[PDB]
Amino acid sequence: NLYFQGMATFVKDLLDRKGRDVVTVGPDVSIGEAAGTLHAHKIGAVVVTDADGVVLGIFTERDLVKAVAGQGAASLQQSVSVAMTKNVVRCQHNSTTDQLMEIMTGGRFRHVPVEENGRLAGIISIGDVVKARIGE
């Protein structure tokens, strides 16, 4: 496939518009507090990192639902580590908004962390992708 210049087609482009920052929680935070962080920052996702900066996993509103479905009130006390998804799929600065959609559709998740040089460098969400395919 082949693309033109400044049509918001690449991950690098989306980052320039929205921002490079990522909100994170540590692994020993409880489920109930991860949810409180979701709400104060108005986001659907938080990346789980350790003392040293390693990505451990990813927790979203959808993990919240599964947790309470299965174990009710008690699950708010449990550590974010038992509900989070450990195998985290990523993209690169040069990934395209087309690939991204196919990853999100096929894998059935809505958040993709951006990597470069083994580093965490931002996060792209389905709502970013969608806005890009309109805003001009």
Ligand X SMILES: Nc1ncnc2c1ncn2[C@@H]1O[C@H](COP(=O)(O)O)[C@@H](O)[C@H]1O
Query: Which residue numbers belong to the known binding site for NADH?
Result: 18, 23, 44-45, 62, 104-105, 109-111, 125, 127-128, 131
2 to 21: interface string for a second copy, x by CB under 8 A? --------------------
Q: Would the CA dihedral through 79, 126, 97, 94 be positive or negative?
A: negative
User: Looking at 13, 109, 115, 116, which residue binds ligand NAI (CB under 6 A)?
Assistant: 109
The residue type of 77 is Q
- Find the part of the chain contacting ligand X (CB under 6 A) among 3-11, 30-38, 59-67, 72-80: 59-67
- Tell me the C-alpha distance between 84 and 17, whole Å: 29
State the nearest-atom distance from the C-beta of 2 to ligand NAI, in Å: 25
31-67 exposure pattern, b = at least 16 Cβ within 10 A, e = fewer = beebbebbeeeebebbbbbeeeeebbbbbbeebbeeb
The DSSP code for 133 is T
Within residues 56-85, the interface with a second copy by CB under 8 A covers 61-62, 64-66, 68-70, 72-73, 76
Which parts of this chain interact with ligand X (CB under 6 A)? 44-45, 58-63, 85, 88-89, 109-113
